[PDB]
Scaffold this motif. Structure first.
Motif, PDB file in Angstrom:
ATOM      1  N   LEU A  78      19.193  -3.930   0.385  1.00 34.38           N
ATOM      2  CA  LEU A  78      18.004  -4.676   0.006  1.00 34.38           C
ATOM      3  C   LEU A  78      18.251  -5.432  -1.290  1.00 34.38           C
ATOM      4  O   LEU A  78      18.823  -4.890  -2.239  1.00 34.38           O
ATOM      5  CB  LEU A  78      16.801  -3.748  -0.158  1.00 34.38           C
ATOM      6  CG  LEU A  78      16.301  -3.069   1.113  1.00 34.38           C
ATOM      7  CD1 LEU A  78      15.072  -2.234   0.816  1.00 34.38           C
ATOM      8  CD2 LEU A  78      16.009  -4.096   2.189  1.00 34.38           C
ATOM      9  N   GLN A 135       3.088   4.592  -2.877  1.00 39.50           N
ATOM     10  CA  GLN A 135       2.890   5.977  -3.302  1.00 39.50           C
ATOM     11  C   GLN A 135       2.514   6.059  -4.780  1.00 39.50           C
ATOM     12  O   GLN A 135       2.939   6.964  -5.500  1.00 39.50           O
ATOM     13  CB  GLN A 135       4.121   6.833  -3.007  1.00 39.50           C
ATOM     14  CG  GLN A 135       4.484   6.917  -1.533  1.00 39.50           C
ATOM     15  CD  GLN A 135       3.442   7.646  -0.711  1.00 39.50           C
ATOM     16  OE1 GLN A 135       2.628   8.400  -1.242  1.00 39.50           O
ATOM     17  NE2 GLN A 135       3.467   7.431   0.598  1.00 39.50           N
ATOM     18  N   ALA A 182      16.399   1.730   5.025  1.00 34.69           N
ATOM     19  CA  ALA A 182      17.220   1.211   3.939  1.00 34.69           C
ATOM     20  C   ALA A 182      17.524   2.293   2.914  1.00 34.69           C
ATOM     21  O   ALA A 182      18.630   2.345   2.368  1.00 34.69           O
ATOM     22  CB  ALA A 182      16.528   0.025   3.277  1.00 34.69           C
ATOM     23  N   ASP A 183      16.551   3.160   2.635  1.00 35.11           N
ATOM     24  CA  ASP A 183      16.785   4.253   1.697  1.00 35.11           C
ATOM     25  C   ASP A 183      17.812   5.237   2.240  1.00 35.11           C
ATOM     26  O   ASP A 183      18.645   5.752   1.486  1.00 35.11           O
ATOM     27  CB  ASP A 183      15.473   4.965   1.385  1.00 35.11           C
ATOM     28  CG  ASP A 183      14.519   4.100   0.592  1.00 35.11           C
ATOM     29  OD1 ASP A 183      14.996   3.206  -0.135  1.00 35.11           O
ATOM     30  OD2 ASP A 183      13.294   4.318   0.686  1.00 35.11           O
ATOM     31  N   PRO A 222       0.806  -1.229   0.000  1.00 34.56           N
ATOM     32  CA  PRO A 222       0.000   0.000   0.000  1.00 34.56           C
ATOM     33  C   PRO A 222       0.830   1.267   0.000  1.00 34.56           C
ATOM     34  O   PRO A 222       0.378   2.292  -0.525  1.00 34.56           O
ATOM     35  CB  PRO A 222      -0.825  -0.127   1.288  1.00 34.56           C
ATOM     36  CG  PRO A 222      -0.829  -1.581   1.598  1.00 34.56           C
ATOM     37  CD  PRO A 222       0.503  -2.088   1.154  1.00 34.56           C
ATOM     38  N   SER A 223       2.031   1.231   0.572  1.00 37.72           N
ATOM     39  CA  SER A 223       2.880   2.406   0.708  1.00 37.72           C
ATOM     40  C   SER A 223       3.704   2.697  -0.539  1.00 37.72           C
ATOM     41  O   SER A 223       4.688   3.439  -0.453  1.00 37.72           O
ATOM     42  CB  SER A 223       3.807   2.244   1.912  1.00 37.72           C
ATOM     43  OG  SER A 223       4.820   1.292   1.644  1.00 37.72           O
ATOM     44  N   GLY A 248      21.928  -3.979   5.752  1.00 35.50           N
ATOM     45  CA  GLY A 248      21.271  -2.750   5.365  1.00 35.50           C
ATOM     46  C   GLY A 248      20.936  -2.640   3.893  1.00 35.50           C
ATOM     47  O   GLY A 248      20.146  -1.764   3.521  1.00 35.50           O
ATOM     48  N   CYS A 297      12.517   5.330   4.308  1.00 31.17           N
ATOM     49  CA  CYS A 297      12.818   4.088   5.000  1.00 31.17           C
ATOM     50  C   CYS A 297      14.275   4.094   5.432  1.00 31.17           C
ATOM     51  O   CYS A 297      15.107   4.798   4.858  1.00 31.17           O
ATOM     52  CB  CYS A 297      12.546   2.878   4.106  1.00 31.17           C
ATOM     53  SG  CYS A 297      11.331   3.205   2.824  1.00 31.17           S
ATOM     54  N   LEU A 328      20.255   4.465   4.107  1.00 35.91           N
ATOM     55  CA  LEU A 328      21.549   3.801   4.100  1.00 35.91           C
ATOM     56  C   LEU A 328      22.140   3.662   2.706  1.00 35.91           C
ATOM     57  O   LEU A 328      23.268   3.179   2.575  1.00 35.91           O
ATOM     58  CB  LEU A 328      21.436   2.417   4.742  1.00 35.91           C
ATOM     59  CG  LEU A 328      21.253   2.425   6.257  1.00 35.91           C
ATOM     60  CD1 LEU A 328      21.096   1.016   6.783  1.00 35.91           C
ATOM     61  CD2 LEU A 328      22.422   3.119   6.922  1.00 35.91           C
ATOM     62  N   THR A 378      -0.838  11.656   3.120  1.00 40.25           N
ATOM     63  CA  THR A 378      -0.301  10.527   2.379  1.00 40.25           C
ATOM     64  C   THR A 378      -1.412   9.541   2.060  1.00 40.25           C
ATOM     65  O   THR A 378      -2.433   9.484   2.749  1.00 40.25           O
ATOM     66  CB  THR A 378       0.807   9.815   3.160  1.00 40.25           C
ATOM     67  OG1 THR A 378       1.280   8.695   2.405  1.00 40.25           O
ATOM     68  CG2 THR A 378       0.285   9.335   4.501  1.00 40.25           C
ATOM     69  N   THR A 379      -1.201   8.764   0.998  1.00 38.30           N
ATOM     70  CA  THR A 379      -2.131   7.712   0.621  1.00 38.30           C
ATOM     71  C   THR A 379      -1.892   6.418   1.388  1.00 38.30           C
ATOM     72  O   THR A 379      -2.705   5.494   1.285  1.00 38.30           O
ATOM     73  CB  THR A 379      -2.036   7.445  -0.882  1.00 38.30           C
ATOM     74  OG1 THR A 379      -1.706   8.664  -1.559  1.00 38.30           O
ATOM     75  CG2 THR A 379      -3.361   6.934  -1.417  1.00 38.30           C
ATOM     76  N   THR A 380      -0.806   6.332   2.144  1.00 38.71           N
ATOM     77  CA  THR A 380      -0.543   5.150   2.948  1.00 38.71           C
ATOM     78  C   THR A 380      -1.637   4.989   3.997  1.00 38.71           C
ATOM     79  O   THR A 380      -1.994   5.967   4.667  1.00 38.71           O
ATOM     80  CB  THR A 380       0.820   5.265   3.628  1.00 38.71           C
ATOM     81  OG1 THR A 380       1.833   5.471   2.637  1.00 38.71           O
ATOM     82  CG2 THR A 380       1.137   4.005   4.411  1.00 38.71           C
ATOM     83  N   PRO A 381      -2.202   3.794   4.161  1.00 36.10           N
ATOM     84  CA  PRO A 381      -3.241   3.606   5.178  1.00 36.10           C
ATOM     85  C   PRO A 381      -2.715   3.890   6.577  1.00 36.10           C
ATOM     86  O   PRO A 381      -1.541   3.667   6.883  1.00 36.10           O
ATOM     87  CB  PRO A 381      -3.636   2.135   5.016  1.00 36.10           C
ATOM     88  CG  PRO A 381      -3.228   1.783   3.633  1.00 36.10           C
ATOM     89  CD  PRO A 381      -2.006   2.591   3.339  1.00 36.10           C
ATOM     90  N   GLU A 437       7.855  10.575   2.890  1.00 31.53           N
ATOM     91  CA  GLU A 437       8.084   9.316   3.581  1.00 31.53           C
ATOM     92  C   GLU A 437       9.411   8.711   3.146  1.00 31.53           C
ATOM     93  O   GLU A 437       9.873   8.923   2.022  1.00 31.53           O
ATOM     94  CB  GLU A 437       6.952   8.329   3.303  1.00 31.53           C
ATOM     95  CG  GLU A 437       5.717   8.548   4.150  1.00 31.53           C
ATOM     96  CD  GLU A 437       4.570   7.649   3.743  1.00 31.53           C
ATOM     97  OE1 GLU A 437       4.696   6.954   2.713  1.00 31.53           O
ATOM     98  OE2 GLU A 437       3.543   7.634   4.452  1.00 31.53           O
TER      99      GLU A 437
END
Lengths: 33, 560, 101, 102, 51, 51, 51, 51
Positions: free
Chosen positions: B285, B204, G18-19, B201-202, B283, G16, G21, G48-51, G14
Motif C-alpha cells: 500500500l 477503530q 494488505a496487513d 469508519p473502520s 500487495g 486486511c 502481506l 466492533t465499532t465498524t458499521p 479485524e
C-alpha cells in the motif's frame, strides 16, 4: 483605454461584483442595526 | 443537535404560544463561554507559540533554527489569534476538531538582465585580502554579506566554493536571462467543517489506521493555475456546474445566490481523496492523493509531504472509549437546560398575565359626585358602611412560589457538578502548564485538574501540527530562505530521516515554562563554579539572554 | 442631508474604491489592483501601490464566530433579559403612579 | 429583576464596579496572591488579545509604507542618527521586526 | 398562569373592563382581593429535597 | 518594536521612533482608540482602513 | 485470578489482506480465504465499532 | 512524574553539598552532569561528562 493592460477592467464589470455581494452584505447589516 | 442546544434553534426552541412567554435561558452557551477563554489564553499569552528542544547533545543547533523558522511563519504568514479562537471553539462546540495542514507555493517566472564576468587567477596581494574579507563576512554575518558586498566579489567567492581557487572577476558586460521569483511558499493550516470531511469508519478510533479520508472544499480556476503542471485535464470543466448550489452536501458559508461573473475567479467545489492504494498491484500500500471536480479527474499522484500520512489532525473534547469522534458538554446538559427554561417561563407567565395597576372599587361606596372627586385626586366623603382602606383593590404582581426558585437552583447545580464549570470561577489553570506544584494558594484543585486534562489534548494537537510543518520546511524551503529568517549557518537534515523525529521535540511555549527554565540556568550557574570553564559559563549566560528576549546580548556572549 | 457647500472646489461627493485581484494580463495570474469611480465614471485604475500587496483593511472581531468573518456583540445575548427587566420596572412605576396619595 | 441582572452578568462576564484591572498584567508573568487574574479577567484578557493583534497588523502595514514613502532626510530628522535601509524585495516578509503595543 | 373568577362579581360590562386592563367596579358581596384565583406552582415538600 | 535577530537591533530602534512619532503628532491617538474600542464593542466587529 | 497462570488466551480482531502481506513468509495458506465470508456481520460475536 | 524528578534533583544537590567538592573532580562532575539531565539541558550535560 485608461491603462495599458490587455485585460483592462470595465466599469460594468467592477459594479457587477458590487451587485453580487450586496444581498449578502444587506443581511448582515440588519443584525448590526 | 448539539449545536441546536448551544444556539436555541432546533428542538430546543420553545413552541410559539400567544399570550405566553417564549424565553429560554442559554444554559449550554453559558457553560461553554466560561471554557473558551480559559483554554485560549495559554496559547496566546506569549510572543512565541512553539518551543522546540533538542533530544541529544548534538541536536541543539537544529532545534534553535527550527524554532525561529516555525515561529516566524505563524507570526507573519498566519493570523495566530484568529486561528486559535477558531481552534478552541470548534473543539468545545462540535465535540471534536479537525485541522488540515498544507503548503502554498506560487513560483512565477521573471526575465531580467544580469552581468557577465571573466575569471582571472593572477592577482595582487590586496585581491587575496579582498577575497578573505567576503569569506569572513559571509560566515560572520550572512545578511551583511548579501546586502553590502559587490557583485563581482560574490562571483569570485561563488567560484571559490565549487573549485577552491581565488580568481578575479572582471565586468565584461550585461546579458538578459529568465528566473523564477518566489512568492508565497509557506504552510497553511485551517479548521475543517466536520460535515465537509469523511474518514474511514473502520479506523477503530485511530486516524493513523484509517485507509482513506475525503475532504470537500471550494476553489477557483486561478488557484488551480498556481501549480501549472500539477493539475491535468483542466479544460474539461465547464466552470458552470459543480457550484455550491449544485453540490448540496458541501456545507459552506458562501451565500447560495452569490456567484462571480468572471470565469477566472469563479468558485467551484472540489473533492480530495487521501488514502492508501495498491498502485503497483502487488500487495503493498502506498499513500496517494486524488482530486476530482464534477466527475472529472484533475490530479492523481503520490503523497508529496515527507510524513507519508494523512494531513489531518483530530482533537477530541471528551474522548469516547475506542472511538474516533468526541463528546461535547452539550450532550450532558440537554435535559437540564429544557427544565430550566420551563421554570423560568413559568414565572414570567405568572407576572405578565396578571393584572397590575388596575383599580377596583365596590359599587355603592361613593356617590355620583364623590366618585368624581376621588378619581380626580381631590378629597372625598364615603358611605361609612364600606371601608375604603380595604374595599378598594390595588392589583399588583403575585408572589413567586419558593419552589420555582428552588427548582431552578437544582438545575444549575446539577449542570455544574457534571461539567465541572462554574460561573466566575476557574480559568487560572493556564499559569501552571508544565510546572511543578506551587505553594498553598497556587496548587490546582479538583476543578483545575479536569480543565488541565482538556488542555493536554489541545496541546498535543498543536504538537502534531508543528511536527508536520517541520517536516515540510525541510524539503520545501531553500537554503537561502532559512538563512534569511535566521541570520546564521544553515543546518540540514537527511531526507531518509524525515519519517522519524529523532532530533526535535515540539511543545507549546507558555511564559511561566519560560521563566521556570531561566531559573534553572541561574541555579546551575550558581551550582557550578564559575571558574571551572569560561565556555560553559558563557553558554549558560547566552541561553538566559535568549529567554529574556535580548538577542543582541546573546550574540555578544556566544562570540566573546 | 440638506448640507451642501456652494463653492464647487469644496463640494462633497461620494466616491467608491475597489480593492481586489484581477487577471490584468489575461493569462491566469491574479494581481492586486485598485479602481475608483464617481457617478458611473472611472477616475482611477492602477496596481496596488502599497508594498504589502494586499487589501488595506483590518477586521477585529469582538466574540468570534466559528469560521466566519464578522463578530458577535454581547448585545445579542442580552436581548431578552433587557426586555423583561424593563417590563418589571415599568410595573412598579405603574403601581405607584396610578394610585392615590 | 435580580434574576435578570444575575443572568446577564453570568453570560457576558461583566459586573458593575468590578474588573478593569486586567490592563496591568498584559504580557506579564502571573503575580502574587492579590495580583493574579481570576476567571472574569481571563475572559476580558481574551478580547484584549484580538484588539492588540489588530494594532499589530496596523503597525506592520505602516512600517512597510514608511520604507518606500519616506525619504532618507525625513527619517534622519525624526531620529537624529544614521539611516538604516531595507531592500525593496524584503518588504513582503517581515523578517526583521516584531510589532507589539507597549 | 390561569386566572379564575367567581360568577356574579362583575357584570357584563365591568368584566370586559377588567380583562382589558382598565379600572372596574365590583359587587361588594364578593372580595376581588381573595376570590380571584391566580394559580402558581405548588410548594415542594421538604422530604423530596431531604431524600 | 523588537528585533528578531542580533543584526536587527538598529532597524527596530529607528522604526520604533518613526512609528511612534507619527501617532503622536500626525494623528489624535486618544480619539482614535476611543473610536477603535467602541466600534468593536458596539457593532460586534471593527474595520479600519489604512492609507 | 492470575494471568500468568492461564493456559490460553484467545483474541478477536479485524485485519486486511494488505496487513497480512506485510509479513510475507509468516502467514501460510493465505490463498484459501475467499475474502467474502468471515465479515463482521458473519461473525456476530466480535464487537466492533465498524458499521 | 515531575515531582519525583525534582525530588531526585534535590537529592544530588544535598549529596554535592554533603561531599567535599575537592575530594574528587570526577565524582563532582558526574553528580553535576546528572542534574543537567533532570533540568532538560542535554548540551550542558555532555560538556560536564567530557570536561
Amino acid at each position: 483605454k485608461l491603462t495599458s493592460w490587455k485585460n483592462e477592467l470595465s466599469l460594468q464589470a467592477l459594479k457587477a461584483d458590487l451587485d453580487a455581494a450586496k444581498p449578502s452584505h444587506t443581511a448582515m447589516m440588519i443584525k448590526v442595526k | 443537535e448539539w449545536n441546536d442546544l448551544m444556539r436555541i434553534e432546533g428542538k430546543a426552541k420553545p413552541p410559539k404560544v400567544k399570550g405566553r412567554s417564549q424565553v429560554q435561558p442559554k444554559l449550554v452557551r453559558r457553560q461553554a463561554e466560561w471554557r473558551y477563554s480559559a483554554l485560549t489564553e495559554p496559547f496566546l499569552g506569549s510572543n512565541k507559540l512553539f518551543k522546540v528542544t533538542p533530544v541529544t547533545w548534538e541536536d541543539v543547533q537544529g532545534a534553535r533554527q527550527n524554532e525561529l523558522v516555525l515561529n516566524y511563519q505563524f507570526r507573519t504568514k498566519l493570523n495566530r489569534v484568529s486561528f486559535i479562537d477558531n481552534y478552541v471553539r470548534s473543539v468545545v462546540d462540535d465535540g471534536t476538531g479537525i485541522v488540515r495542514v498544507g503548503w502554498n507555493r506560487e513560483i512565477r517566472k521573471e526575465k531580467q538582465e544580469v552581468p557577465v564576468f571573466s575569471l582571472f587567477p593572477i592577482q595582487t596581494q590586496e585581491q587575496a585580502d579582498a577575497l578573505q574579507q567576503a569569506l569572513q563576512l559571509r560566515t560572520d554575518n550572512p545578511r551583511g554579506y548579501e546586502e553590502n558586498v559587490d557583485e563581482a566579489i560574490k562571483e569570485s567567492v561563488r567560484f571559490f566554493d565549487e573549485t577552491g581557487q581565488a580568481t578575479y572577476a572582471v565586468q565584461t558586460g550585461t546579458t538578459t536571462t529568465e528566473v523564477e521569483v518566489p512568492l508565497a511558499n509557506h504552510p497553511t493550516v485551517e479548521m475543517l467543517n466536520p460535515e465537509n470531511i469523511i474518514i474511514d469508519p473502520s479506523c477503530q478510533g485511530d486516524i493513523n489506521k484509517a485507509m482513506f479520508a475525503i475532504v470537500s472544499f471550494e476553489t477557483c480556476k486561478a488557484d488551480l493555475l498556481k501549480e501549472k503542471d500539477r493539475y491535468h485535464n483542466l479544460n474539461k470543466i465547464d466552470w458552470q456546474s459543480s457550484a455550491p448550489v449544485n453540490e448540496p452536501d458541501h456545507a459552506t458559508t458562501t451565500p447560495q445566490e452569490f456567484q462571480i461573473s468572471d470565469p477566472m475567479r469563479k468558485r467551484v467545489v472540489a473533492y480530495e481523496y487521501w488514502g492508501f492504494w495498491d498502485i503497483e498491484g502487488n500487495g503493498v500500500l502506498e499513500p496517494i492523493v486524488a482530486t476530482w471536480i464534477g466527475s472529472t479527474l484533475i490530479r492523481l499522484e503520490k503523497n508529496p509531504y515527507p510524513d507519508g500520512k494523512l494531513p489531518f489532525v483530530l482533537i477530541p473534547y471528551m474522548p469516547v472509549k475506542r472511538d474516533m469522534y468526541g463528546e461535547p458538554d452539550a450532550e450532558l446538559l440537554g435535559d437540564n437546560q429544557a427544565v430550566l427554561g420551563a421554570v423560568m417561563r413559568g414565572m414570567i407567565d405568572l407576572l405578565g398575565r396578571s393584572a397590575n395597576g388596575q383599580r377596583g372599587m365596590p359599587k355603592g361606596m361613593l356617590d355620583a359626585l364623590n366618585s368624581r372627586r376621588y378619581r380626580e385626586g381631590e378629597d372625598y366623603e364615603y358611605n361609612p358602611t364600606q371601608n375604603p382602606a380595604q374595599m378598594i383593590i390595588e392589583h399588583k404582581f403575585p408572589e413567586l412560589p419558593q419552589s420555582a426558585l428552588t427548582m431552578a437552583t437544582l438545575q444549575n447545580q446539577e449542570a455544574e457538578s457534571l461539567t465541572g464549570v462554574k460561573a466566575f470561577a476557574g480559568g487560572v489553570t493556564g499559569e501552571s502548564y508544565g510546572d511543578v506544584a506551587a505553594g498553598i494558594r497556587g496548587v490546582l484543585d479538583a476543578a483545575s485538574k479536569r480543565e488541565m486534562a482538556i488542555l493536554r489534548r489541545l496541546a498535543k494537537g498543536m504538537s502534531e501540527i508543528g511536527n508536520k510543518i517541520i517536516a515540510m520546511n525541510a524539503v520545501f524551503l531553500a537554503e537561502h530562505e532559512v538563512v534569511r529568517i535566521t541570520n546564521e549557518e544553515f543546518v540540514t537534515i537527511k531526507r531518509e530521516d524525515l519519517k522519524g523525529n529523532f532530533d526535535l521535540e515540539v511543545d507549546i511555549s507558555t511564559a511561566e515554562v519560560d521563566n521556570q527554565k531561566s531559573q534553572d540556568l541561574g541555579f546551575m550557574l550558581q551550582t557550578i563554579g564559575p571558574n571551572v570553564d569560561q565556555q560553559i559559563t558563557l553558554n549558560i549566560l547566552a541561553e538566559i539572554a535568549d529567554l529574556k528576549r535580548m538577542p543582541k546580548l546573546a550574540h555578544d556572549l556566544r562570540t566573546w
